[PDB]
């Protein structure tokens, strides 16, 4: 697809869609991740010796709010110069998946948790070319995290 000045634009404004609502998107992504993968749960600090998932755990939100930032940051980074930049916070983010037991098949899981959930979010405005576009920033993304973790273990 490329990532279009067209196909940008529609990325930024789906972002700015999700930001609106952090305690439901994020509530809603931690259940279509326990939909897809139920044994997910025992990983999170915030969610073990719980039996459903907190809704308004500051712990979680902070958590969720800061995963989708990162994706969307990733997809302007495309267009505008044609590839997504590794900093030091990606690598700390590839530490402390391995402290915490998370590996690459779990990323799919996550993939479709965010296409679903920015689905969710831009409903009717939603085109061929905008799944084009988050899809092109996640892949592009998880591509930068999952060579950290690796590095991390
Ligand atoms: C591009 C995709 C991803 C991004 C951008 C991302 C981002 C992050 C960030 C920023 C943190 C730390 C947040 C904090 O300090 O508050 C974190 C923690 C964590 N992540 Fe991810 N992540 C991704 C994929 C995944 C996957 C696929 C899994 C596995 C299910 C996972 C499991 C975890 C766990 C268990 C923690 C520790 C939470 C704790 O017990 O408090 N992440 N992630």
Do not use: C
């Not at 305690?23 to 931690?30: A, E, I």
């Not at 749960?41 to 989708?68: C, R």
């Not at 030091?88 to 590996?103: E, F, I, R």
């Amino acid at each position: 697809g490329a990532l279009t000045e067209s196909q940008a634009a529609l990325v930024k404004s789906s972002w700015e869609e999700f930001n609106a609502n952090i305690p439901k998107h994020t509530h809603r992504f931690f259940i279509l991740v326990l939909e897809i993968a139920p044994a997910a749960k025992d990983l999170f600090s915030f969610l073990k010796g719980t039996s459903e998932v907190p809704q308004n755990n500051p712990e979680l939100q902070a958590h969720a709010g800061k995963v989708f930032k990162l994706v969307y940051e990733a997809a302007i980074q495309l267009e505008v110069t044609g590839v997504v930049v590794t900093d030091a916070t990606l690598k700390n983010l590839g530490s402390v998946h391995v402290s915490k037991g998370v590996a690459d098949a779990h990323f799919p899981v996550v993939k479709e948790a965010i296409l679903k959930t920015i689905k969710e979010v831009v409903g009717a405005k939603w085109s061929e070319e905008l799944n084009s576009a988050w899809t092109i920033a996640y892949d592009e993304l998880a591509i930068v995290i999952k060579k950290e973790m690796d590095d991390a273990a």
